[PDB]
């Protein structure tokens, strides 16, 4: 074929972390939706996404996840990587469930292991992992568990792959538009799911970051004066900041380097209703310079 | 390669051992009369607490460390297949312990097996030694206990169907004494079973009932939960098999309501209760760990309680209130 | 031997045919990647009523005549094994009709198959003919319909998991027109499936929920029961799969109680109810037949109902009141 | 061995009957207890029982049940014989369950079929089928179903076998003693379970017959005058009768030829409490001759 491009690459999935005396599947993230293998999924494929945004279909030829320890040799416990063909089945809750997965790999946190998921031969659609039936669009589900260890960053998980992409299309949006109201509850999202919305009160706005990296965020909302209370309730660094706030109208832009699964908080709000997030991925020299 | 300032015959201690476990697909084949399954399942994590002679973690050796298969704790995956058959015979049966812990750890872990399905505990470290089928190691090491398999078909059944000595092969058990207070290793089981006589599927739900005043409690079905406190003020059930359940609990108090909680490890995902008069009912979608408790507290004049537990996924949520 | 006053080439009508069916043990074997099961299970009895064009007995062609396996109605025994796997592929699949009735009987029985898992009904006898996979016979005769098996893995799933065209192979169905009003024959299925990708066991319970006011009803798990009437005065559930269940039903009325009954074939073995305020709960141990109803009548201002059904045996009786 | 006697024989199990438009397992009898294969079970082995009463242990070498039609060739429907190794598992409720039994045999009611249950090699105890763990004492369970047919006696079920019996013992009672009270509810039974007790009121006494054949019954109880109301609420014939009734003390002896699963009723009772049944098996020329 010759509308067919083929890519081989190794990129960054996520950091595998554990908490002391807990099971902790997928870093405690939960909703086994953003761990579907479509690619397109900027959590699993943060580098492939800029390419796959330009195509309609994908087929993996080889796909392998790799754990490389960040932790030292005296560390106790166990990490585990698993893969289910059903991208929609729920995760493992206990260790007993974890062990029945056909495609499983477990090793002590200071060692290296890897998991080779099996690829089939079918073209599927590159889409949102929320844009229709999971079983039709996703090869399957990926996930990890870390138990009986300490409470720390245990390792880096990489993914190495060879995909075919097919059918060039106009680019899917490589940015995020996340809208909310007040007065309602509707929370329409458009573009990649970089950030998620935890709560939209009238006092506080909290956006949790599902995707590690450096961004430029634009947040805009309706309050009644106040505003200036930005902080990172996780591991991150507001490298550049601009704020402006008056009546029923305020706006915040910033060059955060969020990571793992950190947090973005607008605290001193007062009488807030509508709000919208705009996320794009950038470096740091994309730094805001007006105050 | 190559170790400093050493003569041969030295034994050199590493600081930690990594053993790597990969997923294992099950093998089926029919021995003309029997279906034969080979697979590896996860028994339990093995923990000890400091300064205790910790036997079977908390728990103690009861009737779900009995080998039959049909035993959700010992054979989570196999249970479903076994329900479709009437009798079984183990061919090979090995328990394997994979260390979770580094070699500065110290203490003892031990695996034992006894043919008396309802053999009581080893009472202390000295008794523990007298078993014929015993493996004792340092917690940072790997080991395995091979269970002697005899050559007799016994019925596939939950432990509530007459003499356990008739249906169960024996009893598995572990102990951790001395040593720290931590999760020391994984305990896997490797097995090859023959299943005989296909039949219509046995039910896999639990029905645990108590009265009050008669004092006796009766269980049918699998031992997912156990009843720990009777009382008229409290009802506590204990998880014996980790997982997500849709539990239905019905009982006779005198008016008042109930206060549900999960002491220990676990979360409630979807509650619903209706409590009055001399009748109350509580149905919930819980995820729970081994040895955690589901307590119904704040009861008032409660007699007669019954529990219905079935395995579900978290998303089988109760939707009314 | 030897028939009176006959020339050869004659065809001689007997008065009845006896075909004898014996029990069939299942065969397992692993095709290196897949486990392969061959077995024969009982689909349903095939009845007609007089002067009706009776399609799928009462019922009508819905989403549990869909082939997937994982389908309690079509594969009672297989369900349990299938729950332990992620995808399937049928190798051979035959439906077989064994006459229950003598040759003075008359009328037509017909078996059909359609790839559209959610193909609607054949509307009349003429439409019924247009199927490509059809078998039409006199009711006193024997026949079998062979379903074309393709060569693609599809997911093992209950019919409540996205497009049924993705997970189900096709749809089975039967019709009986003209003829008397009686039970005409047995319908067996012979199959060989390959199951792939072992996984932790899928839940086999049912969770059927409705609101009221939103009008929509949602099902998770197997289709043992179906919701037929909403109402604020009545709640009726219908058995789609014959057997004994422990059903838990919870809903929101405004005070009053409930009046349970089993219209159609079935018996209640152990009731318990608590009904007040804006919350009621009814748990029971019922044995029920295909197309019978479990009705909660005498309701008063009832919105929001949820059902939990699991297979049990009669002896899993509710013990409180 | 030479405390070992070996018997080969073919005797009468029961009549297989159906009711129109019903499933009807075991003639509607129910409690799958008196269908356990021990022998000793006077329902399955009415001829072997007189022998096995004299021994402690049994092993079957071959065992086969046989259905011979009583019904004609135009009869519709289907009979089925099944066998479970677990004498304690409940019967089949629907046809779907019936079909999953490994040892099953079904044929149209006007034809002959048979079922060969598989014998193992273990000695078990000859006992009550209520005298301890079913799985330890019974080879298994037998049973039959008749569906989609008419409402009639469809056929005779016979059993053909070869047993070894071991260990001579003093004879187990070949009679029945069934006691009841009033004032209590306790209902102690001793000997073979020929008859069962359905209700013991104060107005009526009803004994249902679990075992086809000719008997001599002695029933004795405590009322307050009255008594004389004997009848057979099934298929049977009170071939000989003696009654005597006064105050808190009455007594009935009779030579009934009960069958299938008939009934014995004492109607005109008044103020009855204690009662006891004595059943022994006899011919008819064991006829009561005093009035
Ligand atoms: Ca799955
Ligand atoms: Ca012992
Ligand atoms: Ca169609
Ligand atoms: Ca059984």
- Of all residues in chain D, the one with the smallest CA distance to B33 is D102
The CATH architecture annotation of domain C202-321 reads: Sandwich (2.60)
CB distance D104–C76 less than 8 Å? no
Of the candidates B16, B20, B43, the beta carbon closest to that of A73 is on B16
Dist CA C242 CA C231 (whole Å):
25
CA angle D23, C315, B314 (to 5 degrees): 105
Dist CA A149 CA A265 (whole Å):
30
Beta bridge partners of A240: none
| Extended strands (E) in chain A | 5-18, 55-69, 78-84, 103-107, 113-117, 124-125, 141-147, 152-168, 176-180, 189-191, 195-200, 205-209, 213-221, 230-232, 238-245, 250-258, 263-266, 275-281
Q: State whether residue D51 is helix, strand or coil.
A: helix
Chains B and C are touching, with contact defined as 3 or more CB–CB pairs separated by less than 8 Å: yes
Looking at the complex, report in whole angstroms how far the Cα of residue C162 sits from the nearest Cα belonging to chain A.
Answer: 6
| DSSP code of residue D27 | G
Provide the 10 A C-beta neighbour count for residue C259.
12
For residue C82, the surrounding DSSP H or E stretch is helix C78-82
- For D133-168, the DSSP string reads -HHHH-S-EEEEEEESS-SEEEEEEEEEEEEEEEEE
Dist CA C123 CA C136 (whole Å):
16
The bound ligand whose nearest atom lies closest to the alpha carbon of D87 is: 4
| DSSP code of residue B58 | T
Residues ≥6 apart with Cβ < 8 Å to D184? none
| DSSP code of residue A95 | H
- For C130-159, the DSSP string reads T-SEEEEE-TTS-EEEEPPP-S--EE---S
Instruction: Specify the residue for token string 């812990």.
Output: B101
- Chains touching B (at least 3 CB pairs under 8 A) are A, C, D
* B172 CA distance to ligand 2 middle (Å): 11
Q: Would you say the C-alpha torsion C240, C243, C249, C255 has a positive or negative sign?
A: positive
Can you say how many angstroms the Cα of residue D259 is from the centroid of all Cα atoms in its chain? 10
The bound ligand whose nearest atom lies closest to the alpha carbon of B115 is: 2
Q: Give Cα separations from A226 to A200, A248, C177, C304, D107 (angstroms).
A: 16, 10, 77, 44, 86
Is-contact C306 C207, C-beta < 8 A?
A: yes
Dist CA D101 CA D81 (whole Å):
10
**Chain D interface includes C77 (CB < 8 A):** yes
H-assigned helices in chain D: 49-52, 95-98, 134-137
Instruction: Specify the residue for token string 């923990």.
Output: B47
Interface mutation target, options B78, B202, B274, chain C, most CBs of C under 10 Å: B274
* C121 CA distance to ligand 3 middle (Å): 9
Interface mutation target, options A96, A100, A142, chain B, most CBs of B under 10 Å: A96
Q: Where are the domains of chain C?
A: 24-201, 202-321
* C202 CA distance to ligand 1 middle (Å): 7
Of the candidates A97, A102, A133, the beta carbon closest to that of C197 is on A102
**Chain D interface includes B200 (CB < 8 A):** yes
CB distance D84–B163 less than 8 Å? no
Looking at the complex, report in whole angstroms how far the Cα of residue B162 sits from the nearest Cα belonging to chain D.
Answer: 6
- Of all residues in chain C, the one with the smallest CA distance to D108 is C18
Chain A hits for B102, Cβ within 8 Å: 73-76
**Chain B interface includes A82 (CB < 8 A):** yes
- Chains touching D (at least 3 CB pairs under 8 A) are B, C
**Chain A interface includes B13 (CB < 8 A):** no
Interface mutation target, options D20, D22, D71, D76, chain C, most CBs of C under 10 Å: D76
Tell me the two tokens of residue B217.
């409690």
Residues ≥6 apart with Cβ < 8 Å to A109? A18, A69, A71, A75, A76, A77, A78, A79, A146, A149, A154, A155
Q: Measuring CA to CA, which residue among B38, B40, B47, B37 is closest to residue B21?
A: B40
Beta bridge partners of B134: B112
What resolution does the deposited structure have, in angstroms? 2.9
End-to-end CA distance of chain A: 52
Give burial (CB, 10 Å; 0-12/13-18/19+) of B276: middle
H-assigned helices in chain B: 78-82, 125-128, 164-167
Is the preceding peptide bond at B212 cis, omega within 30 degrees of 0?
yes
**Chain B interface includes D121 (CB < 8 A):** no
Phi/psi for A135 (5° steps) reads -70, -20
* C56 CA distance to ligand 3 middle (Å): 16
Chain D hits for C183, Cβ within 8 Å: 21, 147-148
**Chain C interface includes D97 (CB < 8 A):** yes
Chain D hits for B202, Cβ within 8 Å: 89
Q: Measuring CA to CA, which residue among C243, C221, C225, C107 is closest to residue C175?
A: C107
Is-contact D146 D18, C-beta < 8 A?
A: yes
Beta B182-198 vs B35-48: how paired, if at all?
antiparallel
Q: Measuring CA to CA, which residue among A196, A198, A195, A233 is closest to residue A216?
A: A195
Chains D and A are touching, with contact defined as 3 or more CB–CB pairs separated by less than 8 Å: no
What CATH number belongs to D1-291? 2.60.120.20
For residue A49, the surrounding DSSP H or E stretch is helix A49-52
* B170 CA distance to ligand 2 middle (Å): 10
**Chain B interface includes A103 (CB < 8 A):** yes
- Of all residues in chain D, the one with the smallest CA distance to B154 is D135
The bound ligand whose nearest atom lies closest to the alpha carbon of A92 is: 1
**Chain B interface includes A106 (CB < 8 A):** yes
Dist CA C315 CA C294 (whole Å):
19
CB distance A96–B42 less than 8 Å? yes
Reply yes or no on domain B24-201 having CATH 2.70.150.10: no
Provide the 10 A C-beta neighbour count for residue D2.
4
Q: Give Cα separations from D166 to B169, D60, D138 (angstroms).
A: 28, 11, 15
Phi/psi for D134 (5° steps) reads -50, -45
Looking at the complex, report in whole angstroms how far the Cα of residue C201 sits from the nearest Cα belonging to chain B.
Answer: 6
- Of all residues in chain D, the one with the smallest CA distance to B155 is D86
List chain A gaps (C–N > 2.5 A) by preceding residue: none
């Amino acid at each position: 074929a010759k509308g067919s491009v083929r890519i081989t690459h190794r990129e960054y999935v996520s950091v595998l972390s554990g908490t002391n005396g807990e099971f902790l599947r997928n870093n405690g993230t939960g909703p086994n939706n953003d761990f579907s293998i479509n690619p397109l999924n900027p959590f699993l494929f943060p580098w492939l996404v800029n390419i796959a945004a330009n195509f309609d279909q994908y087929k993996f030829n080889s796909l392998r996840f790799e754990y490389v320890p960040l932790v030292n040799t005296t560390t106790n416990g166990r990490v585990a990587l698993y893969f289910d063909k059903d991208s929609e089945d729920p995760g493992p809750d206990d260790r007993a469930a974890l062990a029945n997965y056909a495609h499983l790999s477990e090793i002590s946190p200071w060692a290296i292991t890897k998991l080779t998921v099996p690829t089939d031969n079918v073209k599927r659609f590159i889409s949102d992992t929320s844009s229709g039936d999971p079983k039709l669009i996703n090869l399957g589900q990926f996930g990890w568990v870390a138990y009986s260890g300490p409470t720390a960053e245990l390792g880096d998980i990489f993914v190495e792959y060879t995909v075919d992409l097919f059918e060039a299309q106009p680019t899917s949006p490589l940015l995020e538009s996340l809208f909310r109201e007040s007065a309602s509850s509707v929370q329409t999202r458009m573009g990649l799911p970089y950030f998620s919305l935890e709560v939209a009160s009238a006092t506080d706005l909290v956006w949790q970051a599902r995707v590690p990296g450096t961004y430029v965020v634009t947040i805009i909302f309706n309050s009644t004066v106040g505003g200036l209370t930005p902080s990172i309730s996780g591991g991150g660094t507001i490298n550049s900041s601009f704020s402006v706030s008056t009546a029923g109208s305020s706006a915040y832009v910033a060059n955060i380097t969020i990571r793992v699964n950190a947090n973005l908080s607008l605290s001193g709000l007062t009488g807030a209703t509508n709000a919208q997030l705009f996320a794009v991925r950038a470096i740091t020299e994309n730094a805001v310079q007006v105050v």
